Design a protein around this ligand. Structure first.
Ligand SMILES: CNC(=O)c1ccc2c(c1)OCCc1cc(C(=O)N(C)c3ccc(C(=O)N4CCN(C)CC4)cc3Cl)sc1-2
Length: 841
């Protein structure tokens, strides 16, 4: 291994934020085995991808143009403005024209074909055989009433993407020797025992306990725990879960390894301490902190794997069971039905999750029958892809490799555009895979390496987790490294720039947070030191440019130091502004970015991404709710970026600017603000309309997600009328619809009006459009809770969304339910809003 290659691994380590060659925290070779296992999938995708299309990463969709976007084209014509160093002719185009085609109606229309169309000021290309109406940038421009400005230039050199070459029928038992912790002192000395569980898909096959003993820094049982399950019956993917109760600590050990071998020998496992149900509890990783953590010693001394028509009424029971929601509990009666009627069940793709939860995974013969069942998979294979269904089979309830692979098989058919929609949840779903190398992980690897946009986000989503999750960083690092080894030198250089930038801003963030207290109010002293420090960075270890992490097509240049500052809030986040490093840009507007330290931005990414999913869901229904899921990215431990939405203010600041002593609240302020920021009544009417739509979308989305009761300071609005929520980091009301919002709607004092009627109509339409996707929403909600929050009750917390989506009810009762919800806010008026500030005194 050349000295060059060692320097390279060093490079990857700094981009990843973890050393994948570190062997300090392992008890076997799973991780190394996986690094090697992933080489094949990587080389295969690299060798398979088209260098040209890969370099230009066109962003496209096969989906039809929504009704609400056809509205803006009734002339069957679209205008593209091409530019080239001086003047710019505006070509009239047909929505079906191909980029190379409009290049024919150009060159000849003017009068060598080795040129390509690129969006002005962006690293975005319109290429490939695709109708221009199928390009996302084109649809984004129409939806925003913006013109499509493009520049004619030379295709990027694929050479820049060069990738560096690479080079027994006995019952199961376990001996618990004892436990050891360096320091126990809490308050009162209690007693302690060890609980050993054998689990599969968060289902206990057998449970055993040790006798209680005095809790001292060292407790030695030296006791055999014999389980009812036979060795031969252990399913691959089963975990020996070990727990200490006084519940204090846990740790897991895969009973059958990545080689299909039964675990054997001595183990000293360092455990995880509970913070006083979630994905972290399922991890096969052990606590890396060997100095301050509890450990448990165990011994293993115990390779494997070597007609009749249904009556009308049972079938009805069966179909009823299948119709129930993902969260409906399956009775013992229900499971037996599903299993007995196995072959009938297999004819309904929607039964798959319920059927595989009916499997007795602790019985070799049954599992086998199950694999036999999966053999004739025709009905499933030809079924239309249902993302909600697929994700159900990737959650914590399925530990079987084969069950999860068919889920992954269905994902193979997603277009890149959809992958981007679900990417974050798919990455989080890697936490439910029992092995490091899995079909799900390889699919993400493959898709990321196939498309630059997916690779970029895949990188940040992985790095965010590597940086702040001890439970999963090892697995995610191996995945990221594999990816980094195939993305190409260009991407590598880009990621390097981005990582350098955020690292510098982190330093700065910290140093500046130090030069001030815990809030007040800053301090011209504090702002000046910031500007100096940035001036220092600017010249230079701070790279010429870098891609915006939440908007990779955008290249950020030099900081505009005069415009930077520290925001006035408890935490002291930076308000940074940069110049665009692309001369071809259509404006002088800077790139605003908020850099913040002290908060875990992962919950916000999760919420913002779900918001994006709701928008695409609504698109599948021809609806546009005008949400504004601003860019947000966890870039490392307790740090990240947030997009600064231009021309936007807080609803509270608007209130506050007019008196606002102790937080008095006037109904007409909002309407006045909008009218004053409008240059004309036209623009004002557009603002009001957009407000109605945006208000409706956020009321619905926020109710469903159970995040509806918010303080005014957590909700913003653009000067153009777009309302939107922010800060999703962790009497009552379902959502925020205050009298001022109502005032803009032309209503006041519980009355009606054309815009308000229009609002209720949009809400209801929005609400029921989401109910057609109930299962997708429920499964995303529950995964989000398991992988993104603290230790959430696996029933009651998750059950909220079921109630919220009013599962089980017909359309009439649903509309009713929501309309009453709208009434509650009205009756409550300003109460909850009003309650703030006082709680603090
Ligand atoms: C011209 N644009 C803006 O002023 C602006 C302000 C805030 C945001 C923005 C634009 O983009 C939209 C997304 C966004 C998201 C935010 C967020 O998540 N949090 C937690 C947040 C809330 C308040 C502040 C804050 O201190 N201030 C200073 C007072 N000012 C009136 C509001 C923002 C900072 C953050 Cl990061 S702030 C914010």
């Amino acid at each position: 291994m050349s000295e060059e290659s060692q320097a390279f691994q060093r490079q990857l380590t700094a981009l990843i934020g973890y050393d994948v060659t570190d062997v300090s925290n392992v008890h076997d070779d799973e991780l190394e085995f996986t690094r090697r296992g992933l080489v094949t999938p990587r080389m295969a995708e690299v060798a398979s991808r088209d260098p040209k299309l890969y370099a230009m990463h066109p962003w496209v969709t096969s989906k039809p143009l929504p009704e609400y976007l056809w509205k803006k084209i009734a002339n069957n014509c679209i205008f593209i403005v091409i530019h080239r160093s001086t003047t710019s002719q505006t070509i009239k185009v047909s929505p079906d024209d191909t980029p190379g085609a409009i290049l024919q109606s150009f060159f000849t229309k003017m009068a060598e074909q080795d040129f390509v169309l690129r969006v002005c000021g962006r690293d975005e290309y319109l290429v490939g055989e695709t109708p221009i109406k199928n390009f996302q940038w084109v649809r984004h421009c129409l939806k925003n009433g913006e013109e499509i400005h493009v520049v004619l230039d030379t295709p990027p050199d694929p050479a820049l993407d060069e990738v560096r070459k690479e080079e027994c029928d006995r019952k199961f038992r376990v001996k618990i020797r004892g436990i050891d912790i360096p320091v126990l002192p809490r308050n009162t000395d209690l007693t302690v025992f060890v609980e050993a569980n054998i689990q599969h898909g968060q289902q206990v096959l057998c449970q055993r306990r040790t006798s209680p003993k005095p809790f001292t820094e060292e407790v030695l049982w030296n006791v055999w725990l014999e389980f009812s399950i036979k060795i031969k019956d252990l399913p691959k993917g089963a975990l020996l879960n070990l727990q200490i109760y006084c519940l204090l600590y846990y740790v897991n050990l895969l009973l059958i390894d990545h080689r299909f071998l039964l675990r054997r020998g001595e183990y000293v496992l360092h455990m995880w301490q509970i913070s006083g149900f979630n994905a972290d509890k399922l991890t096969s990783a052990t606590n890396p902190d060997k100095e301050n953590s509890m450990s448990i010693s165990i011994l293993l001394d115990n390779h494997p794997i070597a007609r009749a028509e249904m009556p009308n009424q049972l079938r009805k029971q069966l179909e009823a069971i299948i119709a129930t929601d993902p969260l409906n509990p399956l009775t013992a009666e229900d499971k037996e039905l599903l299993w007995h009627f196995r072959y009938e069940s297999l004819k309904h793709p929607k039964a798959y999750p319920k059927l595989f939860s009916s499997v007795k995974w602790g019985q070799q013969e049954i599992v086998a029958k199950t694999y036999q069942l999966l053999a004739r998979r025709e009905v499933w294979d030809q079924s239309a892809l249902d993302v909600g269904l697929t994700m159900q089979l990737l959650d914590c309830n399925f530990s079987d490799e084969n069950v999860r692979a068919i889920a992954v098989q269905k994902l193979e058919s997603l277009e890149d555009d959809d992958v981007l929609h679900y990417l974050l949840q798919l990455v989080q779903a890697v936490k439910f895979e029992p092995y490091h190398d899995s079909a799900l992980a390889r699919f993400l690897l493959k898709r990321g390496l196939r498309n630059k946009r997916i690779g970029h986000f895949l990188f940040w989503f992985l790095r965010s987790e590597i940086a702040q999750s001890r439970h999963y960083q090892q697995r995610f690092a191996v995945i990221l490294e594999a990816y980094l080894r195939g993305c190409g030198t260009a991407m590598l250089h880009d990621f390097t720039q981005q990582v350098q930038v955020i690292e510098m801003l982190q330093k700065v963030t910290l140093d500046i947070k130090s030069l001030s207290a815990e809030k007040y109010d800053v301090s011209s002293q504090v702002i000046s030191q910031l500007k100096q420090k940035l001036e220092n960075l600017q010249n230079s270890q701070l790279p010429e440019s870098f891609r915006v992490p939440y908007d990779p097509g955008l290249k950020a240049g030099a900081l505009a130091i005069e415009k930077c500052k520290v925001m006035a809030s408890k935490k002291k986040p930076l308000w940074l502004e940069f110049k665009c490093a692309d001369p071809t840009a259509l404006s002088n507007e800077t790139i605003g970015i908020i850099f913040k330290h002290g908060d875990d931005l992962r919950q916000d990414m999760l919420i913002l991404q779900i918001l994006r999913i709701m928008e695409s869901i609504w698109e599948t229904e021809s609806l546009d709710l005008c949400l504004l899921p601003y860019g947000c990215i966890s870039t490392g431990d307790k740090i990240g970026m947030i997009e600064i939405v231009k021309d936007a203010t807080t609803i509270a600041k608007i209130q506050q600017s007019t008196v606002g002593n102790t937080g008095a609240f006037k109904d007409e302020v909002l309407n006045h603000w909008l009218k004053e920021k409008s240059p004309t009544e036209e623009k004002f009417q557009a603002a009001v309309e957009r407000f109605v739509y945006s208000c409706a979308g956020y009321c619905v989305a926020t109710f469903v997600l159970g995040i509806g009761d918010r303080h005014n300071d957590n909700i913003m609005i653009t000067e153009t009328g777009n309302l939107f929520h922010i800060d999703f980091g962790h009497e009552r009301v379902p959502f925020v619809l205050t009298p001022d919002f109502l005032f803009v709607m032309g209503t006041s004092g519980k009355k009606t009006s054309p815009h308000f009627q229009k609002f209720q109509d949009i809400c209801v339409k929005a609400y029921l459009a989401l109910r057609h996707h109930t299962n997708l929403l429920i499964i995303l909600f529950s995964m989000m809770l398991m992988t993104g929050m603290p230790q959430l009750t696996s029933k009651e917390d998750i059950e909220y969304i079921r109630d919220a989506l009013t599962v089980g009810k017909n359309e009439e009762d649903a509309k009713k339910y929501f309309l009453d919800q709208i009434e509650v806010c009205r009756d409550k008026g300003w109460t909850v809003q009003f309650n703030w500030f006082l709680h603090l005194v």
